[PDB]
From Swiss-Prot, chain A:
It comes from the Eukaryota. It is a single-pass membrane protein. GO terms for biological process: mitochondrial electron transport, ubiquinol to cytochrome c. Keywords: Electron transport, Membrane, Mitochondrion, Mitochondrion inner membrane, Respiratory chain, Transmembrane, Transmembrane helix, Transport. This is Cytochrome b-c1 complex subunit 9. It comes from Bos taurus.
UniProtKB/Swiss-Prot annotation, chain B:
It comes from the Eukaryota. This is Cytochrome b-c1 complex subunit 2, mitochondrial. The modification N6-acetyllysine is found at residues 36, 169, 220. The gene is UQCRC2. Belongs to the peptidase M16 family. UQCRC2/QCR2 subfamily.
Swiss-Prot record, chain C:
GO terms for cellular component: mitochondrial inner membrane; respiratory chain complex III. It comes from the Eukaryota. Belongs to the UQCRB/QCR7 family. The modification N6-acetyllysine is found at residues 13, 72, 77, 82, 90. Keywords: Acetylation, Electron transport, Membrane, Mitochondrion, Mitochondrion inner membrane, Respiratory chain, Transport. Component of the ubiquinol-cytochrome c oxidoreductase (cytochrome b-c1 complex, complex III, CIII), a multisubunit enzyme composed of 11 subunits. The complex is composed of 3 respiratory subunits cytochrome b, cytochrome c1 and Rieske protein UQCRFS1, 2 core protein subunits UQCRC1/QCR1 and UQCRC2/QCR2, and 6 low-molecular weight protein subunits UQCRH/QCR6, UQCRB/QCR7, UQCRQ/QCR8, UQCR10/QCR9, UQCR11/QCR10 and subunit 9, the cleavage product of Rieske protein UQCRFS1. It is found in: Mitochondrion inner membrane. This is Cytochrome b-c1 complex subunit 7. Component of the ubiquinol-cytochrome c oxidoreductase, a multisubunit transmembrane complex that is part of the mitochondrial electron transport chain which drives oxidative phosphorylation. InterPro entries: QCR7, QCR7_sf. GO terms for biological process: mitochondrial electron transport, ubiquinol to cytochrome c.
Curated annotation (Swiss-Prot), chain D:
Keywords: Electron transport, Membrane, Mitochondrion, Mitochondrion inner membrane, Respiratory chain, Transmembrane, Transmembrane helix, Transport. It comes from the Eukaryota. InterPro entries: Single_a-helix_sf, UQCR. Component of the ubiquinol-cytochrome c oxidoreductase, a multisubunit transmembrane complex that is part of the mitochondrial electron transport chain which drives oxidative phosphorylation. The lineage of its organism: Eukaryota, Metazoa, Chordata, Craniata, Vertebrata. This is Cytochrome b-c1 complex subunit 10. The gene is UQCR11.
Length: 61, 423, 105, 51, 446
């Protein structure tokens, strides 16, 4: 589980250059979400009220 | 508790073709077509033709192309191979028993349908160069080649390997003519292991009814004697020294066979002093460095060569040779114990029985028996003939070597190699 | 035996004269596209046929360069036209098709 | 002129390279899906519809 | 006539018996007038240590040079004078002394082998003599490029382990190794549970036992109890050894991935795949038209002088690959083609070629077991390595099972995306960088 998992990864996903490429491509989609989420949210938190995304509620409709 | 064995079945067709089979109930089958077409049948206008011929055994035939022979055989894990001596070619084929049909057809196509196409033949001539090159890297190959070149004037003088001057020069006509002249019925023997004699006979009566080259196993080899010397720098001098012996078959030839074992052939015991080898022991008594001696014994249809083959350092060459030759001379003078002669007999007999143990070996015996004798001659009766050798005949064998016009071949740094002349 | 197969022959002799490789001393087998099958059959040609072939082509490319043609006398008569390559070419394709069937199993 | 390529061996060898060729279109499309942000397809994918 | 199937059944039961000892005593009766008898010891050089090493070889060298009962010269005298052939070899795992003799001589044949394998009179005189001889062998063995490269491939693949050792050992051991060292190895390793009396030819099993009991009476009789150890498993590295020498006219490369070793069912299937790749030699008849795509391209493009596939087995491990020999500008192309072969077979082995390999293997097998000596060696070895003799029919069964899938599977398991061991010798400028070799061990397309 904590040792024999790089193993489990390798058998199922990394041996075949297809499933390798499939993993990097399937893996990249999920990464692009999680990064443009997290990092935008990191960038939010470092301004907190400098940006029109926070001001929004002021001038209504 | 195995099968009570089948016997060999042996048949002479009226055209003089010979068929022998054995049904060993083996998973594999061996088939040989043994032809009287060895190198002695080349003349001075077509030297090498039988060596190209030796190599040409997977060139296109009439209804089996080159590609098919290779793929057809390889597809069944078959082998096809062709072995020449100075007297015979031996086209032998091997596979699993269910596959004799495909292999036999290939075999007969090679020996009776060779097309010899210009361009295939031309493509092959570089291979005599490679083939010669590989073989001629045992110093012995050269020696025994020169030894024969020096002994005979004719026929057995010819080399198993193509002269360099003929490489690129042997023709499709010369090939064609060689097959026509030599691969006829009177000259062939079809031997089969793990096949049945009815089938062999059918194959033979159908496909191997060929005749109209020549009759005679016969230019008749004229022994002449002489010496050929080849300066090497190889640091070890190989040398063979030899007189005319006895033609294979004859009673005298078994005298020599036994004398070979008195003086001593190969080793029996891994890294042994060869306590039983007279030649080795006589040479050792004089000589304190690396050497080898063995009694040499070749025997052909219409002659043979006997003597011994030395390997020494360049400076000891003579000392070795003179030690070796004396030791023979000493048997000619009559110094030979009956238990010595007995020992050599058990050595020979066991060596024979040993030699025919495997299919490759047995088939070869039977093939050559067929061509030299026109018979099969069982172990029981070979050993009988061996036993039949008198102590005196062996002395006389050795007498004959000592007194007979000699032949020598040696190669190395020859500065202390003797000259016949000087022995 | 036949009026009509002498006509297919007359059509053939027409097209032959019409093609007009003859006009430059060429033979039909000089004119063949060199592919691998063809290339090998040229390899397989005996010395003389090869040497004759190279000369025909050499003479023709020379004429073709100088935009000329032979004397009508010296053209290649349809009947006199030997398919010297045909048997070689056929044997090559024959050998190739074998290799091709073997490659299938 | 492709008659050559029709025999037992060829069908074995195609049948060999089939799971691979299957996955290579999986790679190629999903890459095109991701690289164009194909909208039409990606709405189906949980997590990834970020709207 | 007999089918080949039928023909396999006809081959007799290898009869096995155990002595009150450990010593197994085994025989195949045939109607031969002639036999091979001898002793397969489970001594080798996997079994030795760094200080020990090259002992068994020094023993082999001593083994025929005279016993307590038959002093120095005289064993030779007896063997020779009865027209028999005495012989020996040692491997990294196996030592074998055997006699080819007349069948009527199986009595004194056994009598001798017994005297040899126990009562070796290791006379000081001789151990001294032998050391110069064994050194000379080392000097001449240095000239066989093939012998070298396989020693290097062993030296690098097994890198750390006793299996990395040569059978002869290093120069220094040969010169320092004492009689004490030798008898210690002898008394450790030449015990009855670790040796088989094997015979093939013209004999009843009953006589073979009678003679086993007579002359192998009390070997491990009261013995055994103290400090017999089992073999350690041997770590495979995968790794490279390049010994570059442009003074030599051709390059030897030998490449290998890790084998499963003696016991494993996978050996059969690997041997098939091997058979398909096969071997080449520049003296091979008819070149372009060879079945094997390696051997074909090799011959057409003059890409080498020789190759050979192999699968060497040891206990629980082994070396599976190929070795070749070529010109300095062939080393790359030869490497490419061999590697691309392995991969083709890993990924896309067709049905047809596998039947060829299967036949090639059957033909090898039957043909290999030809006459007393091979069959005897196979009796002796087999009992060491399988604990049985495996009957020819069983091999046919094991062969027949294999097809294209069984190939692509068992090849991919051993070959695909695996670190090889490389050994290289002679003019080896163009031997592919190790990374690039290891890149060759998988296809990107797959």
């Amino acid at each position: 589980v904590a040792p024999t998992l790089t193993a489990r990864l390798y058998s199922l996903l990394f041996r075949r250059t297809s499933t390798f490429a499939l993993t990097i491509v399937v893996g990249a989609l999920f990464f692009e979400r999680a990064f443009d989420q997290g990092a935008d949210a990191i960038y939010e938190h470092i301004n907190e009220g400098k940006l029109w995304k926070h001001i929004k509620h002021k001038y209504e409709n | 508790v195995p099968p009570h064995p089948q016997d060999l079945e042996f048949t002479r067709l009226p055209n003089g073709l010979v068929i022998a089979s054995l049904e060993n109930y083996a998973p594999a089958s061996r088939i040989g077509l043994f032809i009287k077409a060895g190198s002695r049948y080349e003349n001075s206008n077509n030297l090498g033709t039988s060596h190209l011929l030796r190599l040409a055994s997977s060139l296109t035939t009439k209804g089996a192309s080159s590609f098919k022979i290779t793929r057809g055989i390889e597809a069944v894990g078959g082998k096809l191979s062709v072995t020449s001596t100075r007297e015979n070619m031996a086209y032998t084929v091997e596979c699993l028993r269910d596959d004799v049909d495909i292999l036999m057809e290939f075999l007969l196509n090679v020996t009776t349908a060779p097309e010899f196409r210009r361009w295939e033949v031309a493509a092959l001539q570089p291979q005599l160069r490679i083939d010669k090159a590989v073989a001629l890297q045992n110093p012995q190959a050269h020696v025994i080649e020169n030894l024969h070149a020096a002994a005979y004037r004719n026929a057995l003088a010819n080399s198993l390997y193509c002269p360099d001057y003929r490489i690129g020069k042997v023709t499709p006509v010369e090939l064609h003519d060689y097959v026509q002249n030599h691969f006829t019925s009177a000259r062939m023997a079809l031997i089969g292991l793990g096949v049945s004699h009815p089938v062999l006979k059918q194959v033979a009566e159908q496909f191997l009814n060929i005749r109209g080259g020549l009759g005679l196993s016969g230019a008749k080899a004229k022994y002449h004697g002489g010496e050929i010397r080849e300066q090497n720098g190889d640091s070890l001098v190989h040398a063979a020294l030899v007189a005319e012996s006895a033609a294979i078959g004859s009673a005298e030839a078994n005298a020599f066979s036994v004398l070979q074992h008195v003086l001593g052939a190969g080793p029996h015991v891994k890294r042994g002093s060869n306590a039983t080898s007279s030649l080795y022991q006589a040479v050792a008594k004089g000589v304190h460095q690396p050497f080898d001696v063995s009694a040499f014994n070749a025997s052909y249809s219409d002659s043979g060569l006997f003597g011994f083959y030395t390997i020494s350092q360049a400076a000891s060459a003579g000392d070795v040779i003179k030690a070796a030759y004396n030791q023979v001379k000493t048997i000619a003078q009559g110094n030979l114990s009956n238990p010595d002669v007995q020992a050599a007999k058990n050595k020979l007999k066991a060596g024979y029985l040993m030699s025919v143990e495997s299919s490759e070996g047995f088939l070869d015996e039977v093939g050559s028996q067929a061509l030299a004798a026109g018979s099969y001659t069982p172990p029981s009766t070979v050993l009988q003939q061996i036993d039949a050798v008198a102590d005196a005949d062996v002395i006389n064998a050795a007498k004959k070597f000592v007194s007979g016009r000699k032949s020598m071949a040696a190669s190395g740094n020859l500065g202390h190699t003797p000259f016949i002349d000087e022995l | 035996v036949s009026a009509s197969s002498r006509w297919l022959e007359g059509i053939r002799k027409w097209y032959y004269n019409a093609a007009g490789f003859n006009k430059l001393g060429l033979m039909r087998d000089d004119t063949i596209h060199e592919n691998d099958d063809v290339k090998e059959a040229i390899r397989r040609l005996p010395e003389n046929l090869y040497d004759d072939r190279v000369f025909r082509i050499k003479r023709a490319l020379d004429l073709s360069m100088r935009q000329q043609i032979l004397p009508k006398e010296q053209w290649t008569k349809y009947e006199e036209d030997k398919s010297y390559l045909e048997p070689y070419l056929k044997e090559v394709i024959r050998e190739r098709k074998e290799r091709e069937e073997w490659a299938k199993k | 002129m492709l008659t050559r390529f029709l025999g037992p061996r060829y069908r074995q060898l195609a049948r060999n390279w089939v799971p691979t060729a299957s996955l290579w279109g999986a790679v190629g499309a999903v890459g095109l899906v991701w690289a164009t942000d194909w909208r039409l397809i990606l709405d189906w994918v949980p997590y990834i519809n970020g709207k | 006539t007999a089918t080949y199937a039928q023909a396999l059944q006809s081959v007799p039961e290898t009869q096995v018996s155990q002595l009150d000892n450990g010593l197994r005593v085994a025989s195949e009766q045939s109607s031969q007038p002639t036999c091979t008898v001898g002793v397969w010891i489970d001594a080798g050089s996997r079994y030795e240590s760094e200080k020990n090493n090259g002992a068994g070889y020094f023993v082999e060298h001593l083994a025929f040079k005279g016993t307590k009962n038959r002093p120095g010269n005289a064993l030779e005298k007896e063997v020779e004078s009865m027209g028999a052939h005495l012989n020996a070899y040692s491997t990294r795992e196996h030592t074998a002394y055997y006699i080819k003799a007349l069948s009527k001589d199986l009595p004194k044949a056994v009598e001798l082998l017994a005297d040899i394998v126990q009562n070796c009179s290791l006379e000081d005189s001789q151990i001294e003599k032998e050391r110069d001889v064994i050194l000379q062998e080392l000097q001449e063995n240095d000239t066989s490029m093939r012998d070298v490269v396989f020693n290097y491939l062993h030296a690098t693949a097994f890198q750390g382990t006793p299996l990395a050792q040569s059978v002869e050992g290093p120069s220094e051991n040969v010169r320092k190794l004492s009689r004490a060292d030798l008898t210690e190895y002898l008394s450790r390793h030449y015990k009855a549970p670790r040796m088989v009396l094997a015979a093939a030819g013209g004999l009843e099993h009953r006589q073979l036992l009678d003679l086993a009991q007579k002359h192998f009476s009390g070997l491990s009789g009261t013995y055994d109890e103290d400090a017999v150890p089992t073999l350690s498993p041997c770590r495979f590295t995968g790794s490279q050894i390049c010994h570059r020498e442009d003074g030599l006219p051709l390059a030897h490369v030998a490449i290998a991935v890790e084998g499963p070793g003696w016991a494993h069912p996978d050996n059969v299937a690997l041997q098939v795949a091997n058979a398909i790749i096969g071997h080449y030699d520049c003296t091979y008849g008819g070149g372009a038209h060879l079945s094997s795509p390696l051997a074909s391209i090799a011959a057409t493009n003059k890409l080498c002088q020789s190759f050979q596939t192999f699968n060497i087995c040891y206990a629980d491990t082994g070396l599976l690959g190929a070795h070749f020999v070529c010109d300095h500008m062939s080393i790359d192309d030869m490497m490419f083609v061999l590697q691309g072969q392995w991969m083709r077979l890993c990924t896309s082995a067709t049905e047809s070629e596998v039947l060829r390999g299967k036949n090639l293997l059957r033909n090898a097998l039957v043909s290999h077991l030809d006459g007393t000596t091979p069959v005897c060696e196979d009796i002796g070895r087999s009992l060491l390595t399988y604990g049985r003799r495996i009957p020819l029919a069983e091999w046919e069964s094991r062969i027949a099972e294999v097809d294209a899938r069984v190939v692509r599977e068992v090849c991919s398991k051993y070959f695909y995306d695996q670190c090889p061991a490389v050994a290289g010798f002679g003019p080896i400028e163009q031997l592919p960088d190790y990374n690039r070799i290891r890149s060759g061990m998988f296809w990107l397309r797959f």
